[PDB]
Design a binder for these strands. Structure first.
Ligand SMILES: [Zn+2]
Lengths: 155, 183, 43, 101
RNA sequence: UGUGCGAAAGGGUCCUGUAAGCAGUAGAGUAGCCUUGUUGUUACGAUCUGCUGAGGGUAAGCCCUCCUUCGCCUAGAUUUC
RNA sequence: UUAACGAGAUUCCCACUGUCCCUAUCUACUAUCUAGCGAAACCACAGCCAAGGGAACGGGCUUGGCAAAAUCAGCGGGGAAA
RNA sequence: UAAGGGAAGUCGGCAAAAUAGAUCCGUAACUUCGGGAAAAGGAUUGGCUCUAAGGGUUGGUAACAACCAACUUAGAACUGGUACGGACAGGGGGAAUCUGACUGUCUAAUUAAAACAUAGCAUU
RNA sequence: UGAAGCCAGAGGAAACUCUGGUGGAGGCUCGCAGCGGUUCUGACGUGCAAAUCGAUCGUCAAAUCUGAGCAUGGGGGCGAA
């Protein structure tokens, strides 16, 4: 008894690969009598032909390793293989920092904490790499405000 | 001749056994085997390797304080030879060996006292969690015992107990699979 | 179990033999004749 | 990483032992003998920067203070704190002793 | 038909290096609950300690075993002054 | 007395090592044995030597040494083989 | 793979071994000032438990709280060790000479080169 | 690796100089594919193959690799020769 045609037809009917087709070994003559797709569908409905489930590929180890790397494990010099720039680019870091500083300056000018001339010179200082982060820019704005208030109180 | 001891592990070193390392500071290291010699060349600590007498002493698993351990020493002051002294020494060596053996066995039992209580507690916990896996009669066997007790006017619980005795005595293992009949 | 190479066929896809099921219940210690598995078993 | 790990256990690649390191730490004469065994002009940094714990020469004070933060130096410190294995400990392990009168 | 042969097993002798699991006022620290700290407590936590020279392997060209089990046996075929 | 560059050619140094002293051992696939399948190159005839055989050559001739069926694995002196 | 020795081997260190990822210290002559350069020579790298920095939205010196999200970087304690780029992957380096400027190209099937081309230059 | 251009700070009468960023140039460079074909007492040598197989090697953003259509024809063509 040859069942190659039946295996191919059952794969096409079940919508799977031929390695996922299960033909009942105790029903080989009745499966061999099935030459048409209607007969294969009838055997599938009878349960003589079933589609085997997929083989396991779990992501549990990947998720635990992701949580460990999030909390800081496996980040040492023995784990690093690419260069520092290949791992995190300085251009990406700079672009993020510039966008953060420009967003903060636009917010402060819109709210009215700083005026337009102060905004302009702070924009050019941020482009000239004076402030390394948002807290640095905020503290610079505060010290400039303190100097301006002291000058106004003196005058 | 004399019996030396391995520097690394402490086993008896007999003549032509092992290898000696001579260091430039003036110290010599006798090893009983290539295992100890290679671990020494790999700079492993004998105190951290659990198969060594050094580890066993540091862990307190050898009897270290005893009266019988005071009789063997490196005698650096020789004694003029005396036949009577040597024979009474040999008799002393036998008696010391026997006494040391019995005291060592007592020391080991004092190390291993609590095992019975720990095992009994573990067994009680296991039985309490798994009462349902204890041996049980078949339903067909229970029905046959019930009808036989009704016929003979006997105790069904009694018949159940000797049947549990029989199935406890007869241990049968189960095989996987089974032959498929040919057409 | 052979889960490295292939998945286990689900239990609902295999017809359970009446002799094996009756034997397993007899091992567990129940009366199969009192429940009548012959009527429940299909053909 | 270890340089040329295949022939690491040869006698011609042998390093100083921990008991000798303990003797060098407790007594300067032993360390002086070990240093007279070497030639100072061929040493890294002319022999001026030496770690007794690691029994090792370094090219600069920055390099020596640098290795002190590393884990090999800390493992040497831990092993010295535990104590090196010696002949008297080996003798006590079998309960043997020396009768000197 | 034996001081037999074979398969197991037990003992020995060697090799490795202390099994799984459970427990611990061992454990850097962190977070909750409350007595708001008095091992405060509970929880997680590499590792450490004990049970544990333990666990595993051992003839495949290691040894012993009428007296530890089970099996096999006086064939079959061919040829020969 | 020309920098950089080069699968260009040459000498040396450190490191390194079975290159060597001086060899040993292990694994796989062969070779080997079996079942099946199954060529070719080459082939005057053949194949043990020694001395002599004028033409600096003998395998066959002369004179000696000798000389016993049928075979298998290898080998690379001779014949064969580019 | 190999004790001890370490090129004594060989026409010739052929072949093999050694080096190698990343972080940090450091890097000479020469030079067409661009390079050389990853020159050379060094320190380190596991696991675990933490700490710190780097954002967005909402809420009335808010220069403050809450919530949300993900990956990098630095610092510290503890801990196993014969090994920590533990497999894999992955420069040996240096001092010189000759030679062609370089990138490139050809003798398909024995020669890849000081040959050819090239830009630059000169002549008709 | 980091050329022009650009930003900031410190000087300098200015022209310029120094420091830190940004930017992303190159018949630049390590190297995966592809393309090529250096080396090996390599494999193979009546081969898997009338030029193949392994390791190693050169190049890898361009004077790079490549399909189809079309052109050049033997006193010829084409030729980084
Ligand atoms: Zn020993």
């Amino acid at each position: 008894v040859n069942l190659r045609t039946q295996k191919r037809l059952a794969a096409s009917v079940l919508g799977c690969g031929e390695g996922k087709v299960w033909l009942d070994p105790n029903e080989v003559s009745e499966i061999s009598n099935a030459n048409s797709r209607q007969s294969i569908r009838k055997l599938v409905a009878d349960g003589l032909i079933i589609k085997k489930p997929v083989t396991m590929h779990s992501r549990s180890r990947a998720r635990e390793l992701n949580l460990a790397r999030r909390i800081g494990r496996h980040r040492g010099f023995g784990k690093r293989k690419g260069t520092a720039d290949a791992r995190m680019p300085q251009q990406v870091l700079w672009m993020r920092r510039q966008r953060v500083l420009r967003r903060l300056l636009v917010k402060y000018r819109a709210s009215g904490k700083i005026d337009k001339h102060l905004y302009h010179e702070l924009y050019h200082l941020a482009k000239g790499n004076t402030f390394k982060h948002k807290r640095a820019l905020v503290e610079h704005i505060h010290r400039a405000k303190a100097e301006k208030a002291r000058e106004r109180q003196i005058k | 001749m004399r019996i030396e001891n391995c520097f690394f592990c402490g086993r008896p070193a007999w003549p032509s056994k092992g290898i000696t390392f001579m260091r430039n500071d003036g110290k010599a290291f006798r090893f009983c085997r290539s295992k100890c010699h290679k671990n020494f060349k790999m700079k492993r600590n004998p105190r951290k390797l659990k198969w060594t007498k050094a580890y066993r002493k540091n862990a307190g698993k050898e009897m270290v304080v005893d009266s019988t351990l005071q009789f063997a020493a490196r005698r650096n002051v020789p004694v003029r030879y005396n036949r009577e002294l040597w024979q009474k020494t040999l008799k002393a060596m036998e008696r010391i060996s026997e006494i040391r053996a019995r005291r060592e066995r007592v020391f080991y039992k004092k190390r291993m006292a609590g095992k019975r209580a720990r095992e009994v507690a573990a067994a009680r916990k296991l039985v309490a969690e798994n009462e349902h896996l204890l041996p049980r009669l078949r339903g067909s066997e229970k029905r046959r015992l019930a009808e036989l007790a009704a016929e003979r006017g006997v105790d069904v619980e009694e018949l159940e107990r000797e049947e549990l005795a029989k199935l406890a005595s007869k241990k049968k293992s189960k095989a996987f699979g089974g032959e498929v009949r040919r057409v | 179990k052979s889960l490295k190479n292939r998945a286990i066929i689900p239990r609902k896809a295999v017809k359970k033999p009446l002799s094996q099921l009756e034997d397993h219940l007899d091992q567990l210690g129940v009366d199969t004749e009192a429940i009548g598995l012959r009527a429940r078993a299909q053909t | 990483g270890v340089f040329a790990k295949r022939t690491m256990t040869k006698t011609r690649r042998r390093l100083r032992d921990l008991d000798q390191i303990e003797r060098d730490l407790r007594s300067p004469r032993h360390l002086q003998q070990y240093k007279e065994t070497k030639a100072a002009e061929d040493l890294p940094g002319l022999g001026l920067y030496y770690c007794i714990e690691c029994a090792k020469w370094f090219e600069s004070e920055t390099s020596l203070v640098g290795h002190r933060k590393g884990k090999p130096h800390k493992r040497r410190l831990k092993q010295l704190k535990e104590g090196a294995y010696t002949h008297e400990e080996a003798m006590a392990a079998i309960g043997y002793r020396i009768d000197n009168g």
